[PDB]
A paper describes a structure:
However, superimposition of SOS1-ClassIV structure to the SOS1-ClassII structure gives rise to RMSDs of 1.5 Å for overall structure, indicating that two different SOS1 structures have been resolved. The structural comparison indicates that the dimerized SOS1-ClassIV harbors a distinct conformation to the 2.8-Å resolution SOS1 that the TMD undergoes significant conformational changes and the intracellular domains are nearly identical, supported by the RMSD values between these two structures are 2.0 Å and 0.7 Å for TMD and CTD, respectively. Taking a close look, the extracellular ends of TM helices from two protomers expand in opposing directions, except that the TM8 and TM9 remain unaltered, while the cytoplasmic ends of TM helices are superimposable. Therefore, we termed the SOS1-ClassIV structure as SOS1expand. Within the hydrophobic central cavity between dimerization domains, we found that the lipid molecules differently interact with the SOS1 in these two conformations. In both structures, four lipid molecules are determined at similar positions proximal to the 2-fold symmetrical axis. However, in the SOS1expand structure, an extra lipid is inserted into space between TM1 and TM3′ helices at the dimerization interface. Meanwhile, the side chain of Y270 on TM8′ is extruded in the SOS1expand structure to accommodate this lipid molecule. In the SOS1expand structure, two extra lipids were determined to be buried in the dimerization interface, leading to extracellular expansion of the TMD. However, the differences in bound lipids did not result in significant conformational changes in the intracellular ends of TM helices and in the intracellular domains.
Salt-overly-sensitive 1 (SOS1) is a unique electroneutral Na+/H+ antiporter at the plasma membrane of higher plants and plays a central role in resisting salt stress. SOS1, which is highly conserved in the phylae of the plant kingdom, is identified as the only Na+/H+ transporter that localizes at the plasma membrane and specifically exports Na+ by utilizing the electrochemical proton gradient generated by H+-ATPase6,7. SOS1 forms a homodimer and is composed of a TMD and an intracellular domain. Previous studies have shown that the C-terminus of SOS1 contains an autoinhibitory domain to keep the transporter in a resting state with basal activity.
Numbering used by the authors:
A (entry chain A), B (entry chain B): 32 to 503, 524 to 934, 958 to 972, 1007 to 1017, 1030 to 1048
The structure:
Amino acid sequence: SPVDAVLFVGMSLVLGIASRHLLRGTRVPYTVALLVIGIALGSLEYGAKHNLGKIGHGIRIWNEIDPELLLAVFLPALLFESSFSMEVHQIKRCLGQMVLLAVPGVLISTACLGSLVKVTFPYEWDWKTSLLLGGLLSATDPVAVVALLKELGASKKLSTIIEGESLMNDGTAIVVFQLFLKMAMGQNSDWSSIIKFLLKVALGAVGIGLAFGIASVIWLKFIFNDTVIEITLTIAVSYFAYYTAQEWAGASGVLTVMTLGMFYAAFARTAFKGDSQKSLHHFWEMVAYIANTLIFILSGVVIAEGILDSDKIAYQGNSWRFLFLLYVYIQLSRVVVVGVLYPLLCRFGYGLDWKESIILVWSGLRGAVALALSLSVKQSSGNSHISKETGTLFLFFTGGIVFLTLIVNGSTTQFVLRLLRMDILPAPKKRILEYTKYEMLNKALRAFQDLGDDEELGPADWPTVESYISSLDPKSLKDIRMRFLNGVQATYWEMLDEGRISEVTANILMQSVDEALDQVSTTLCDWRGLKPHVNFPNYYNFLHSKVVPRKLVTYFAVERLESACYISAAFLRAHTIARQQLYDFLGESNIGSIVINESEKEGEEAKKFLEKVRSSFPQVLRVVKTKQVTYSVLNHLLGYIENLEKVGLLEEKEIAHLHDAVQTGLKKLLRNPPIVKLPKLSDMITSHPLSVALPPAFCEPLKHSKKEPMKLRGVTLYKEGSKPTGVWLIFDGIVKWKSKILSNNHSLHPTFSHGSTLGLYEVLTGKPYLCDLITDSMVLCFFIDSEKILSLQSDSTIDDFLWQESALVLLKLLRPQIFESVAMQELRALVSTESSKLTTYVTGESIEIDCNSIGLLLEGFVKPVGIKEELISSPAALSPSNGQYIVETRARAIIFNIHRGLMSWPENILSLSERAMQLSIFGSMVNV
Amino acid sequence: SPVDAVLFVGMSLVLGIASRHLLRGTRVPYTVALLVIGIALGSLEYGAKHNLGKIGHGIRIWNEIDPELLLAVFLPALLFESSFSMEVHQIKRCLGQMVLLAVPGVLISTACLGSLVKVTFPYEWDWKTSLLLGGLLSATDPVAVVALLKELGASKKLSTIIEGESLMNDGTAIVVFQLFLKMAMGQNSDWSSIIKFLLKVALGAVGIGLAFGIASVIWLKFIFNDTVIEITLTIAVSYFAYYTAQEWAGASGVLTVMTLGMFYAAFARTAFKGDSQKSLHHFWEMVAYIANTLIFILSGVVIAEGILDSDKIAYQGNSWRFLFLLYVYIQLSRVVVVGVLYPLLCRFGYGLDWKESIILVWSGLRGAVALALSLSVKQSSGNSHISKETGTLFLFFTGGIVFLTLIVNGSTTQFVLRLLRMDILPAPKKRILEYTKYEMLNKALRAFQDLGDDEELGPADWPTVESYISSLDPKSLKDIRMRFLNGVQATYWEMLDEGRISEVTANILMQSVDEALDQVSTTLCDWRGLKPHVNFPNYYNFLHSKVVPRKLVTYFAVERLESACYISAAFLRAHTIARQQLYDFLGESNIGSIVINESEKEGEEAKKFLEKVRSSFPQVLRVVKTKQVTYSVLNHLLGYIENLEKVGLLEEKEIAHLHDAVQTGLKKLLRNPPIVKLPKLSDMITSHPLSVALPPAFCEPLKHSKKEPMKLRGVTLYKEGSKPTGVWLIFDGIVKWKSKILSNNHSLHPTFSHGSTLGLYEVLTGKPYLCDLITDSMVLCFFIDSEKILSLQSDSTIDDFLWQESALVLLKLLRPQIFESVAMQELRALVSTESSKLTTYVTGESIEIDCNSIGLLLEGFVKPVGIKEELISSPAALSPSNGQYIVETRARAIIFNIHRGLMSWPENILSLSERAMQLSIFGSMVNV
């Protein structure tokens, strides 16, 4: 007999596999087909008394399945992954509406449904059992709703809203179902009894789940490099959570497993390995899928057994009337609960409209959970409390509700989508889709360009490759804003590809910009999407209560402000790059200036947040940047190691050691944020690039003490035209430069970065201060007198290096049209190149600027050739006027050699030789 | 009571997880720790009579586990993935030694061990039960051996040899164990009875497994895009294979599941999805891991129960003597079987030496399979045939053998490795390792270069990042050969990265070159590694037996020659590129010429194989190239789609549709090779680049009939100095050009490719044929008379295009020093660039060649300036002599603008500004 049960399980599994395979994108889920097949099989086994053999034995051995055993085997398996694959950031974005739809939504739904099925539902029912029915089919199938919504059209709001509300409705409905099913078996008599029972079954289960989750997350953080033990540990901890919950504490094990899934979705994304997460999700999806198909087949067969029993419930000819009435009651209950919650749903979280309201009310899919609970009721029934017809009627009613609710509410929802103007794709997103379907074509064409150079295998055939990929202004403010926001999206994509931010941060930023793209007509609301993720409420940690450890403060501050810090940094860099790109694209359009000013003013509270973080926690910024840098570095190393393992180029021991080392580094990162000692002033002096010219004797004036590096926001450094009293050093912070005399035109983002010396040009030339410096953020800055640098000017090499640094700063100043749109990173390479040479020019000589090169005069006067004689002053930024410049005074100079298509997609894209190219590579005629 | 069993399962699982986590790289497997813990728990439950509570109930409910149930639950779970993760190409490389070690190796081991444990092993035993013991602990644990060997030092031979021999020893041992355990329960009496029983249990099980594998592979090929249903289908088909095998046909279900795993490892790599394979492997590893830990714990607890029973077997004080004798017998049996098989092992497959012999004999690890079979014996025992002590003694003996065999043979094997000079890493592989640990450093440094440009988060801290990555000639023939082979490895790596070949082909080529690197002293044996994978035995298909379908011939030919065709193509391209790179690296070394000649002569039988394929099947080459091209294109598109899904940049419906389309294309590819119609001559004419100049009236001389395009190998095209009788067209094939008059120096690989016109220069200039053409392979070539082209010369645009193509060919001829090391792909871009212009020069004018540009004279005479007056003839290839050329006759010309470090790793790798750079980016002092 045990072999019969496993044979039934395997047969049901094969039927599930077949039904899912045949019914992909057929506007009908495989689950309803499984239910119908199970009903047919049960009818053939019981209704017709046809001896099915061993399959019949399996049917009759699973017909007597214990209720509690059914819950234990199935319900946690259904609910673990449904609560595991959550995008917890989106949930925390709209958690208020989630709980509002979950707890009081289910309460109201159960109350209304029980009242309706008690007043007019003639079977001489009881109020407790009717409310039990309400709480039974007040549960929404999460996986079916997720699949429907992915097939359905919902940008990001309805998807997560309905997903989470169904997920939490499962738990709330199972809790209320347990409460109502436990009617008067020696307990649950008075109001205090049910209150304490709820307290236990809910809070104790949640606490057990959270404790087990914490223990397992610590274990995972302590597990360095192994995929399999992670899935196995998840299985073991889930089983022990269920065991402790229901056989040690008496709580609800299913709710404990569901809370465990919540905790793993929330605080265990970084605990799991980078490559093990996909496999773990696939395996738990597989467990949930087997559980779902098996519970559906079992429900179908038990319904068929029940409705065609000796009493012949189905052949009464009247039960279907009340089944249709119950479906109407489901619809009415959903309508009334959505209407009641609408006055509060709209004011919290995501804005909900009547369109979203009707999509929400119509997208109620009672599936596996309701069927499992109904099977639980139609088992161990027939006693004094729950009778026998009073049992099947529940099972047949719930099965018919699942049938109708998955056929009509699963099919006609798309037809409703066709109305109400939601299936239409907005132009801001249509541009994105058509661009991404245009990069597919270009990437494929470049690949076919590359795979045509070889000659041993002969030409390729373009038509088949094309067949296999056959699935392929300036005066308008809104278009300019949309182009700017698309540029911001491209910048986020590029910075994620290069590795500024992890996957979750990029997802948050892209979701926010997608939300902001819908309000392109009005002011840019990009930062409004990021507002929930950037919070700096209080700093009670600095009230001396916890600064005594002076190390846990850094840990807590990082763990709380870490994601917000990446979000703000990426936001600022994206808007800077996008502003520069838009300025290049438009040049001098007034609309361009308006939108740039709009973006600059809009991205101000993020700067305020970063300034507050810097002023409160000076060391959190360095730790956060270190964590980001090492995370990106380790991801690159992991990619290289995966490539090597694919090749097999190294032995399976050295490559295993390297992979283990990289995984250990990643786990030590995601476990504890990097510990960086607070740098002293001398450490920053040594780390500063200018310290090479600074002798070690000058490196220890009591290790450069007696001065505090910090400078508050807005503190001036030196006024324009003032005497060069000294030169500053910028170890960390922001300095803004302004000057009317200098050609500050097209200087969109005037800013010097860390590791720079400022004012060196004036102190080594004696000229008045060219630029006015204002510190936009708190800057860790140091001052060194003019006399020290003038003394350092004694030797030739030090003087040459000092004038090289002066030249770099003077390129940053004089020519922001080209060199402002680049960090101080590459300019050091340009100045350090041996081709770039410092030269001294005598009167009568000239400057040999030519093609593919640029020049810079530092001191002296130059006479141009071919133009009216001009006395070009010391800061010149000499450039080839044609694609000359004789010297007239004592002069010394220096010479140098000199995804981003989404902003302008349709505005950034024949000769007899081109056609020859096209034929020699492609087929007859296909544009490249 | 059922809850007790599941509690025991969960406790054992947690203990397994803990033991594996603690004992990673401790030179002791977690399995022995699990065995010891199980023995201790059983001793505490039975030996001390200490009431353990519910854990004790679980122990006593699993103590009475049914034997057949134990096999069913455990053994297929152990063996499915052990037979699933095979690298089947390496197995087919050395299958002869595999079967030799498996079938007769196990037979000899069982015979010798049974004889030894029957002659001197006093318990009044029987011969059948003693041979049963031999066949029981004649099984080697596959997973433990794999883990040990990955920790152990074996390049590629011992690893796969021992892995496969243990894997097949499992099946052979379970078959012989079933045969010996089935002694005289109403069957297996005479020799005919055992012969037919073996025939059934082996061949019928293999056939059932193969049929189920074929059905499931067809199902997988018909499944387009879904990960979960693939794992679920694997589970379902495995269960149904076991069911059909043992409860419908009477065969051995475990052997059927093992053969199913073989079939999936062999012919189902392409059936599974590209992203689902890793998850599926992880899940089945997880199932095998739970099965292994549970069987180990169960074996330990049952041993503890048995040896401390009423009879007190352990406390007899003598059983350990015979246990140690049995361990010595295991060692002696392994020694004798390896010695017997050595005269035949060495002559077949991989060469096996005494060093490999001792590593093989010492690496025998009896693990989970032997313990499971021994538990099967110590259950349903105590009857007339198998007694009761005669049962435990088997269980305690097998458990002690596993204990000793996993402690000493699992630890001292590394110490033996320390001797015999195998742990030493050879210099050819040490160079590879130190290079790959040098690209880690460069990639990390470049990443830190990129992640230092931003300014909102401030500087990064280099020391912590460094801490997290703290795990980091010309006259010698052998060094030159090693450098050349490293260049070939780099070429394979680059061509896999760009996508010439799949992962398996790149793995085969890299394994072959790794094997060849060990014989660097002698002639290059690279092709010897590829020899088993390149076979063209017979072409009976062309005997008119199966050419009537004239479509199944292409299918069968592709399916048989497909991998060999990629291997040969990649081999040829890799050696061409490596020869060119080596010639660039050395220039004119005699050793370089010797090794280049060696490589060219060595890579000749691959050309012969490709020529045979082309002559037999003309259309297989195009189909194979098409399949490769579309596979690479779809992989690139899948990578882009995965990037987009990570971003979340598109809605979850359009991106889902694109992913589904790409997966459907990939499945339609891997299911059926692409169907390409055989191109007609007119199709190739139109597809040829020169057809643009050919008018449509000239495009249909009865669609260019009356001529057969094919030309055999070695057929000349036109002799040097002959009159330009016409111009040829190369649609597909190889042409070699030789000319003493032309500067053929440094022309390492003189070859024109497909889609080219040859001889056009001479026919449009009237000069004698510059080059001598020899067809190195069968070429599909066409001839067009001189009069037609001279007539086409009538119009200006056609003449300009014709002279542009002439210029491209003449760059391919005159300057092979620069333009031979590039395909005809990019040269079309160079000639087609608008900067590259065709100009007509009158006598007295000059050619304006300058920096960053090149020139070409086609007809006329030119006088140089600054050098003795030379009459440079019509083919000139004018180049800037300094980094001039006045015209003297009627002349017309044309102007143009103009992983690979592994070959030379240690010979391809400060100023005051450089130190400033280093400080401004990094910490104090770290070389870049």
